[PDB]
Structure formats: structure tokens, C-alpha cells
Point group: C3
Amino acid sequence: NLYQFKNMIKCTVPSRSWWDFADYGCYCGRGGSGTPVDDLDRCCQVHDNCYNEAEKISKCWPFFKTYSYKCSQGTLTCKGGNNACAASVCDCDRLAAICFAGAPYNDNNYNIDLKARCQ
Amino acid sequence: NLYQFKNMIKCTVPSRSWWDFADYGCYCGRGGSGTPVDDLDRCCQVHDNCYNEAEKISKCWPFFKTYSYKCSQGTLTCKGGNNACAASVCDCDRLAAICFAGAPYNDNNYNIDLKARCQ
Amino acid sequence: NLYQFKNMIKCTVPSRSWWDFADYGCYCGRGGSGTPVDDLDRCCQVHDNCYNEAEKISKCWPFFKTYSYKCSQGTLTCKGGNNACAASVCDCDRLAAICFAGAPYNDNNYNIDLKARCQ
Ligand SMILES: CN(C)c1ccc(O)c2c1C[C@H]1C[C@H]3[C@H](N(C)C)C(O)=C(C(N)=O)C(=O)[C@@]3(O)C(O)=C1C2=O
Ligand SMILES: CN(C)c1ccc(O)c2c1C[C@H]1C[C@H]3[C@H](N(C)C)C(O)=C(C(N)=O)C(=O)[C@@]3(O)C(O)=C1C2=O
Ligand SMILES: CN(C)c1ccc(O)c2c1C[C@H]1C[C@H]3[C@H](N(C)C)C(O)=C(C(N)=O)C(=O)[C@@]3(O)C(O)=C1C2=O
Ligand SMILES: [Ca+2]
Ligand SMILES: [Ca+2]
Ligand SMILES: [Ca+2]
């Protein structure tokens, strides 16, 4: 669920606030419309796409779905007892958190004008 | 719930992203403040009002409330086994999805400045 | 949960829409980044901090967590049957609602540019 995604990002990107990723580029916090502004934005687009696949599972609602995972010393693991939806959502979150850690954060892409950038 | 509202909009407006309706005018994604910018915005105001009525049911929390419905060939039906809250929320969503399909989407009303338009 | 926070604000600030507080300053609707714009924004920062403490309880997810409370004649009380998470979240919400009632609302701080104000 949303909180667990936040916590995964805290796990792999402890130096950044959740808020920095919650309104960034055309896709971080969003979906659809536009050319990704940079590589971090592309992480987010990939995450959105991953959630769309997870949503093909009936009643699978990624931001609402609780899953089981562990953050240990900056490493994320999704636990085996997750149901199909939980497992899928957990992996989407994990892969994104890892992607975010590697992508450089561009201050110029925070809280951008969607009309200007994302058509 | 929120996902189900998204899916209803996908049912009746399959050519548009959810994101296009998630920050539009003074009311799509919002409520209160302002004169609706256009007829689509008015759909959203009506939807907000509908949710306010549903919220008169104790512990009825529209964006969180799961309901039962079916999208078939672009037609939405709310199912009979819904509890009072579920039934009300489902109908609010259905009527809005239908409203959105008919209202023309004005690019100039996406992601507008609320201070400029919605006081 | 989020709806209950909204309702608490309705209890102590019945003359204002929820939407007025949902995107105000650097912290109302947000967290991290920036110097609070005014005393109301400081209420919100305090609320965010309070939620961070509540989140130290395992699986305590403030915006998702249902709690028991009563609004009577503009006075909020958190009820005794709340679990640890519910109790903590309820108090965070209560204290914020009270803070919001006392803090003057500055129209110039609604829906501000985060890049301009909150770095
Ligand atoms: C619309 N989408 C399917 C859902 C469904 C259920 C939800 O519970 C939510 C969303 C959207 C997401 C978007 C995310 C996005 N970001 C990842 C932080 C984001 O753009 C914000 C934001 N800062 O506006 C959210 O509202 C957000 O945090 C959020 O609270 C959401 C949320 O609460
Ligand atoms: C405040 N309101 C009562 C609630 C309660 C519970 C929720 O779970 C949520 C809301 C607000 C709604 C607003 C809607 C709005 N829209 C319909 C997409 C919207 O303005 C956004 C947005 N793009 O900022 C959301 O955060 C939003 O999608 C959302 O995620 C919400 C949401 O997650
Ligand atoms: C990210 N944060 C941990 C969560 C977790 C679960 C949630 O269900 C939600 C959030 C963020 C909050 C932010 C709040 C904020 N405000 C208090 C209204 C806010 O900035 C908005 C907004 N207008 O964009 C929300 O999306 C918001 O209403 C919301 O719907 C949230 C929400 O739905
Ligand atoms: Ca590159
Ligand atoms: Ca008209
Ligand atoms: Ca002061």
C-alpha cells in the first residue's frame, strides 16, 4: 500500500523525503501524459506500468493493498506469504525503490507545470 | 472506492487517461471553491455533492468504500448486494462516469491555477 | 483516517472547506521541504511530525487507520476503545483541528508554488 511504498523509498533513499518523489516530472505521482522528463521520471513511468499489470488481477488495488516485506540495512525483500496481488504490488514497489536510488534527482523537475512539460 | 471510480471512467471514457480528470477545473479532483470552469467541471461538482450526501451515512467514506458493479461493453451497472453506503457511492460514481463521457474535455482547463480560476 | 481528519476540521472549523487546508503552505497536505509559511502551516508541520511518531507503531498507517471519536458542539474527543495506533492518530488529528481553528487563514498561502516557497 501507499505507506509501504513510501517506506521502501525510505529504505533505499533514506536521504530524501517522500515528498520529493510525490510530485516530480510527468509520472512520479501520476501516470499518462507525456514524455518522461528524465531517468528518475522513467522509473516512475515503469512503476505506473507495473501497477497497471497488477491491476489485471481482480480487485487488486495497488495503493490500497497491504503486502509483507522487509527492509534490512537498505535491502528490500518481498516475503513469500503474499497473495498474487500483494506479491505483484510488492515487486513493483521494490523495483521502483531500487530505480529511484540510482536515478539522479533534478531539482528542476520537482513540482513542474504539467501543461508545460507533459503534453 | 477510488480505483473503482477510475475503472468506471475507463468504462465510459476509454480514450482518456484517468489523470486527465484527476486535476481539471475547480472540482475534478477537488470540491468547494469556485465557479465551475465548464460543463465537465460541473459533472465533478455534482459528483462531490453526491459524495457529501453519501457521507451522511455513518462511517461511509466514498473513496475508501468497496462496492460491487459491472462494466459491460461500455455500460455500468451497480449490483444489488451493495450495502447502503456502497450503493450510494456506486451510483455517484456511475452518474459521474456517464456525465464525463458526454462533456467535452477542454485542454485549457487541465491543471489550472486554483487561485486564478476558483476563488 | 483521512475522512475522519476532514470531519474533525469540519468540527472545529465549520466555516472552511476541507479543500482550503488540503493545499496550503509547505506542509498542509505535504511534509518536508521548507520553512513554514505562517502559523497555520506550522500546525500542519506539527501534524506531520505527529503522524511520523504514530508510524513508529508497526503497521500504523495514519491516513488509512480508522479510529473512534466524537464531535459534539464543536468539541472533539478521542474515545477510549482505540488501539495504540488509532489512539495516537486520533490525538494527532484532534490537536491539529484545534490548531487550525486558532490560526488565521492567509489567502496568499493557498496553492502556492512549492519551488518558490518551500525549498
Ligand atoms: C488514483 N490512484 C489510483 C490512487 C488510488 C488510491 C490512492 O489512495 C491514491 C491514488 C493516487 C496516489 C497518487 C500519489 C502520488 N505520489 C506518488 C505521492 C501523488 O501525485 C500525490 C500527490 N502529491 O498529489 C498523491 O496524491 C499520492 O501520493 C496519493 O496519495 C495517491 C493516493 O492516495
Ligand atoms: C480527501 N478525500 C476525502 C479523500 C479521501 C480519501 C482518499 O483516499 C482520497 C481523497 C481525495 C482524493 C482526491 C483525488 C482527486 N482526483 C479525483 C484524482 C485529485 O485531485 C487527486 C490529485 N491528482 O491530486 C487525488 O489525490 C485523488 O485522486 C485522490 O487520490 C484522492 C484520495 O486518495
Ligand atoms: C502519502 N501519504 C502517506 C498518504 C497515504 C495514504 C493516503 O491515502 C494519502 C496520503 C497523502 C495524503 C495527502 C493529503 C493532502 N491534504 C491533507 C489534503 C493533500 O496535499 C492532498 C492534495 N490536495 O493533493 C492529498 O492528496 C491528500 O488529501 C490525500 O488524499 C492524501 C492521501 O489520500
Ligand atoms: Ca539516461
Ligand atoms: Ca453548457
Ligand atoms: Ca506567529
